[PDB]
């Protein structure tokens, strides 16, 4: 077997840009027998370049593949917003292997998110969990800090948090954090609150309710 | 048009078994090799087996190796994996893939791929999900939220939608989340402008054939 070393792990990049993309393998892949894959969230991979360097039909001049033996490249010479993708690398000299792919994130200017608060419905208070949701939409970039103070007092453990994959048309991402708690804990206390600080943010915002409103 | 087709997955309890079907078009197909890929959740892509044109060769990754079976029909331009005991690493989605055209061996690169289907390897139980209201609040910028709470189903997945497809804009819906239930979970938000919460109704349809779930939830100011 054959490993496919992709580096690097992720690359963040303006429109415009160049990107390039590296893959070594452990060892000579016959005749270069190397493909490169794009593939965005929920969709099959599209087969960017095989054989080193024969573009795929109908993939654009952009992409184009060099390298020989075990150092193989792939160079996004402009970089359009609809390249937010992850690109691997596969052998097929040897059984086939992939790389774990690079990331390929599309920079953009600084975006700070707006802050949602839900408090749980009552249909899911019956249920006997308390679910409190708190919502940060389209900001950049993708680091933010969630926090859940009830009574004030900063809760840990408890949360899961989810994020969409940078838009299309702004680039941006949208946060959704869940806040679980038993009726019980929930009901013992009034003030909840989500605590929201954002590169783009001058200083920590916090949004809440009481459980009376 | 050059398709593929896969079916036949979904929830299997561990030592199972299932068998995937690939049905193609839009090629001679009984010249090329079909190949089976696979794609756990989160990871990446895993070579399956792969089968040439005549089923005169046959190969497996050692992963499957005596437990997955491949096979064609030439006659109906399908290929077919039997998966017999199946374990937790089983569980990805399967992708049916047909190399570029004119290359030199069975197992190769792949242009044309499947939609993919998704096997899930456990002995949880499928279970409808919970869908439960984000009521909008009364503002920043003139912007209120809304969305729907789906809430502890299995297997994945769902899909949600707002108005049955008419409300696009504004939608964030999100990855699934595993609970330390092992349930899954997910919301689907919109961001709208406040006074629009009078001139318009917001109905969240959420999807979960492996139950045959159809929920339709009204969301309204609370
Ligand atoms: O029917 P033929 O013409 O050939 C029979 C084959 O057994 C033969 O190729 C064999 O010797 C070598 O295969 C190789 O060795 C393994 C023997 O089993 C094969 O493995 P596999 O069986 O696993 O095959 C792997 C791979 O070669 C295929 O999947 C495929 O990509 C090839 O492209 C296809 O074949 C055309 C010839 O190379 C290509 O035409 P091509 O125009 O290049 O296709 C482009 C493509 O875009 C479009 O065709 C498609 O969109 C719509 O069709 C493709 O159609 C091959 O690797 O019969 C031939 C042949 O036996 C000999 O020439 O005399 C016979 C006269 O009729
Ligand atoms: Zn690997």
């Known amino acids: 077997e054959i490993v496919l070393t992709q580096s690097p792990g992720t690359l963040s990049l303006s429109p415009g840009e160049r990107a390039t993309l590296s893959c070594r393998a452990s060892?000579?892949?016959?005749?270069?027998?190397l493909a490169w894959y794009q593939q965005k969230p929920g969709q099959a991979p599209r087969l960017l370049i095989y054989?080193?360097?024969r573009r795929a039909t109908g993939i654009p001049d952009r992409f184009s593949g060099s390298g020989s033996a075990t150092d193989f490249t792939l160079t996004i010479s402009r970089l359009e917003p609809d390249d937010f993708a992850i690109y691997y690398c596969?052998?097929?000299?040897?059984?086939?292997?992939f790389g774990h792919g690079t990331k390929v994130e599309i920079k953009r200017t600084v975006a700070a998110p707006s802050v949602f608060i839900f408090p749980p419905s009552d249909e899911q208070l019956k249920s006997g969990t308390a679910s409190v949701v708190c919502l940060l939409n389209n900001f950049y970039p993708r680091e933010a800090k969630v926090q859940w103070k009830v009574d004030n007092a900063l809760q840990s453990g408890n949360s899961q948090e989810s994020v969409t994959e940078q838009d299309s048309k702004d680039s941006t991402y949208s946060l959704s954090s869940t806040l679980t708690l038993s009726k019980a804990d929930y009901e013992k206390h009034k003030v909840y609150a989500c605590e929201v600080t954002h590169q783009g943010l001058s200083s920590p915002v916090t949004k809440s309710f009481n459980r009376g409103e | 048009e050059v398709q593929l087709v896969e079916s036949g997955g979904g929830l299997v309890t561990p030592g199972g078994s299932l068998r995937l079907s690939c049905a193609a078009s839009?090629?001679?197909?009984?010249?090329?090799?079909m190949n089976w890929v696979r794609q756990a959740p989160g990871k990446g892509l895993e070579w399956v087996s792969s089968?040439?044109?005549?089923?005169?060769?046959?190969y497996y990754a050692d992963s499957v190796k005596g437990r997955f079976t491949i096979s064609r029909d030439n006659a109906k331009n399908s290929v077919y994996l039997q998966m017999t005991s199946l374990r937790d690493e089983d569980t990805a989605v399967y992708y049916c893939?047909?190399?570029?055209?004119?290359?030199?061996?069975?197992?190769?690169?792949?242009?044309?791929w499947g939609q993919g289907t998704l096997v899930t390897v456990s002995s949880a139980s499928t279970k409808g999900p919970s869908v439960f209201p984000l009521a909008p609040s009364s503002t920043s910028g003139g912007t209120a939220a809304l969305g729907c709470l789906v809430k502890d189903y299995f297997p994945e997945p769902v899909t949600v939608s707002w108005n049955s497809g008419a409300l696009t804009s504004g939608v964030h819906t999100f990855p699934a989340v595993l609970q330390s239930s092992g349930l899954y979970s997910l919301s689907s938000v919109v961001t709208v402008p406040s006074s629009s919460l009078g001139t318009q109704t917001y109905i969240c349809n959420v999807n979960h054939k492996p139950s045959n779930t159809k929920v339709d939830k009204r969301v309204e100011p609370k």
């Open positions: 089968i040439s044109r005549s089923s005169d060769y046959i």
């Open positions: 054989d080193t360097s």
């Open positions: 839009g090629f001679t197909f009984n010249t090329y090799s």
């Open positions: 060892q000579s892949v016959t005749s270069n027998y």
């Open positions: 893939a047909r190399d570029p055209g004119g290359m030199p061996t069975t197992v190769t690169t792949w242009l044309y």
């Open positions: 596969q052998q097929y000299g040897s059984p086939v292997t």
